[model samples]
Target: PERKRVSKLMAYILRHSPEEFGLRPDVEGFVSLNELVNALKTVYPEVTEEFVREIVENDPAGRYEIRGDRIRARYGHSFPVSLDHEEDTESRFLYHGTPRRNLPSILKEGLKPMKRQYVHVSTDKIEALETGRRHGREVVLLVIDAECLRKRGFKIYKAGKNVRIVERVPPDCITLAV
Candidate 1:
């Protein structure tokens, strides 16, 4: 229970609002692990730096990444940390999973980030389906013309193992996934 509590708090602060706990991650979305541990102590005193390290390394979802003494959430950020994600070279198709209720606007306007800094997508269809299922009971999977986006200079970043973050997906580049 203690470790899980710490893990949740870390995810909350790292992904959504670092400033909520006075954590000022760098432009690349990294905060030193020791500094993070210091902040974690305020709420969960039993969690040590090594314990947090274990959580980042062992998380099944690959939600976080640690480099040297620093750590950051891999995706799903409401904050503006860029993470300096590189341009895509491997993905041919990008899949977006969303609630059916958003289809009217999404089909017409394309996928925007909504409240997040970047729109999240996946390279796998089922993965997108699972992602979409989280927001609503009825899910819609949309496929992006990734090659078209690439040719037009739209950069897609590999934000995690399955999550691809992009600035925008214009209507011309989207189609209902068959």
Candidate 2:
């Protein structure tokens, strides 16, 4: 009973509150309930209205909101990606758009640089094995959210970064060719 109530409250808050997701507050007020739910699905594929409602019913401190076809949430508490826990001195390989049609070329680019480049784990995911062998930390690759491309007028496959993971290479480093 208590959990269900809490979730409902959370859903309500998420539906109506300003986003604490670091997105500008000026844009937060335009979101509606339906849009919020949709965004929740994008971020959390398993999210349901009941789950959203339970969150709204229980956690008053949870910062999340729905605004203009987007679901925004505060990422500081405990999120899949936490910037605070990450190291600062890391290189990055940001793939701005999709490279599926050109997957062969994209793969070649990443592979070429692995032999001679500092691939960022948070940005250069192709350098995973290289970084692991040299420093023992998994090489990171920072990928931009792929969905933005479709929303911003690009094709669905052309929205996110193109990552090439090859087992033959031992998975150490990442390379950004573009």
Candidate 3:
């Protein structure tokens, strides 16, 4: 339970509000481990360096990356930070997991990175469904024609190993998955 709590706090810091915690990631989205541990101590006194390392090593989402004495979220950044992740992977369709409530707006406006810097996508249906479940039980998956988007000059970047990111996606290229 403490591990889960620490993981959530870490994600909030590294991915959403670093400034709120007085920590800033570099251009490549890395913050010093020492600084992070100190910051965690304020809210999570039990979070230790060893525990942090364990989280980075074993997070099922593959969200955090530890390099040298620094760590950062591999994806899902609200701040303007970029990571040197792989790109141009081929997929017939990329899936975006979203709630049914957001589906109508998304279908009309296309997909935008509402809060985060990049629109998050899943490489597989199961991953998409899992993501969608976070928002609500009535999950909707949006299918993106990635190849078509690539040909149309849209850049697709793979975040971590399971997630993908795009600046935005046009509605024409998206369809509801049955």
Clashing pairs in 1: none
Q: Give the higher-lDDT candidate: 2 or 3.
A: 3
RMSD of 2: 15.1
Candidates 1 and 3, the one with greater TM-score = 3
TM-score of each: 0.89, 0.22, 0.94
True-vs-predicted CA distance for residue 166, candidate 2, Å: 51
Instruction: Give each model's whole-structure lDDT.
Output: 0.83, 0.35, 0.86
Q: Which prediction has the highest TM-score against the true structure?
A: 3
Residue range 1-178, candidate 1, lDDT tens digits: 7767877888888888788778889888898788888888888787787888788788866888888888999888888776776778888888988888898898788888888888888888989999889888888889898887777777898878777888889888985554
Off by over 4 Å in 1: 1-5
Measured on C-alpha atoms, candidate 3 has an lDDT of: 0.86
Model 3, 116-136: lDDT tens digits are: 898888888899889899988
Q: Going through the candidates in order, what is the number of backbone clashes in each?
A: 0, 41, 0
Give the winner by lDDT: 3
lDDT of 1 at 155: 87
Give candidate 1's whole-model lDDT.
0.83
In model 2, state the lDDT of residue 71.
Answer: 46
The CA lDDT at 81 in model 1 is 76
